[model samples]
Target: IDQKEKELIKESWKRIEPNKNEIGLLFYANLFKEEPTVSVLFQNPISSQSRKLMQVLGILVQGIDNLEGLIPTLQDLGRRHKQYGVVDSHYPLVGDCLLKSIQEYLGQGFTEEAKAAWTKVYGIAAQVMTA
Candidate 1:
């Protein structure tokens, strides 16, 4: 990532680190709003459960320290999501929701730089899924 991207990521971390629950809530809320039909797939109360969401995010944060090690885990997650009928199009929806949530939470602190940074990250993630 470039300096601007790094700065945005730092800003994002600062914003999300303090309000993990809000992040989780906004993510799912936006997701379900956009695709209510898919929401039913998460019928298992445990799936939408806050603790599980927080734990997943915690793992993601930690995995950033060792991204290479996380790839296999991500691949496994991709396989699991495939079982849920996840498609390439769904990635953009997730990215849009995530960035929108971040912008909502950060307010003025969210800059174009931050949005670009996330866009890049999401693009790379989507590429991985397609690969």
Candidate 2:
């Protein structure tokens, strides 16, 4: 059920925070390397942006089940990202790098079930962000 995925998400998220700084770096590195064109969209320095990215992710995890409440928060992000030049096409690229970054650091703990949970969660976020 959804609860299992939620549990998996929360558990893995806890593991992530301890090393989020590194993962964020890796996420961007992978993103820029994989999709060079989008690099311009992120004009700010990566170090600070990386921490902010983790914070935003923590908020999403904190409200994973509270879609009604999260909707406004996500909507704000969506609008702001659009203003920052984030396009619909960039979401999937970001998603791929995000997951890959997590898997890179998470190692074997990033199990199939965990990957499935994150994939679902990211998809939900993307749907709202691009809506």
Candidate 3:
């Protein structure tokens, strides 16, 4: 069943976009704070990079079920991120920070089901990215 929390993801991310920039800021800030050494792996104008991050997230969120399309897209990104110093170990850390950031933004609405959905997604996609 590719239901994959499609509805939950859609509902929450719609709310997330309102504070899009803040979410981005929180993500990277917390990511770096949580895993300081990865800071050197990042390169960017925070604003632009943050925008790209959200954009790509939207892509993954929207494209999750269409594996034929999504897998290739993620593979391309994986190769590119590899060039930028992203490693196998980095995926879980990034996923952890992203889920944390999403939960922070979701506040009271971040339900157990919501967390489960996002967790399954990040786990699946990160596996693909690592593949």
Candidate 4:
């Protein structure tokens, strides 16, 4: 992404960060609703997983400007996710649910540009993760 997109992501993240866990919970709900089959992947409670999802997202935002620099981390995470039984199909579901969760939380603050920016980063990350 470009500098402006990065700026949009950071600024928008600050608004969403305060209630990240809540959104995280909602995100998983959306995920399960959209693809019930994926629910089996989460043998452990989802609350803890929700927390980790937001935490990882924060880490990703922290490195949004240097996406290439984060490739190693993303690759490692992808491998771990694979070991955990995550398939290629689950990536887009995760992204859409995340975006929808943020939209529900942010309301008016989630502009089209912000959605696009988030989509761009999520797509890039997913590509690396599924690579």
The ten-residue window of minimal lDDT in model 3 covers: 60-69
lDDT of 1 by residue, 5-119 (tens): 6556656666667787777777777789987777876655633664565665456544444445666666777787788787777888777877788788778777877788868
Best by lDDT: 4
Clashing pairs in 3: none
**Residue pairs that clash (backbone atoms under 3 angstroms), model 2:** none
| Per-prediction backbone clash count | 0, 0, 0, 0
TM-score of each candidate structure, all chains considered together = 0.78, 0.95, 0.90, 0.95
Tens digits of per-residue lDDT for model 4, 13-44: 89878989888999889888988898998988
Ranking by lDDT: 4, 2, 3, 1
Against the hidden true structure, what lDDT does model 3 obtain? 0.81
Pairs that collide, model 1: none
Residue 69 in candidate 1 has what lDDT? 69
Q: State, as a TM-score between 0 and 1, how close model 4 is to the true structure.
A: 0.95
- Residues 1-131 of candidate 3: C-alpha lDDT, one tens digit per residue: 25647778787777776787888888989898999999987878877889998888788667756655788877888788889988899888889898898788768877878888878888887788887
- Backbone-clash count (model 4): 0
Candidate 3 ranges beyond 4 A from true positions: 1-4
Residue 46 shift from truth in candidate 3, angstroms: 1.6
Q: Which ten residues in a row have the lowest lDDT in candidate 2?
A: 64-73
lDDT score for residue 25 of model 3: 84
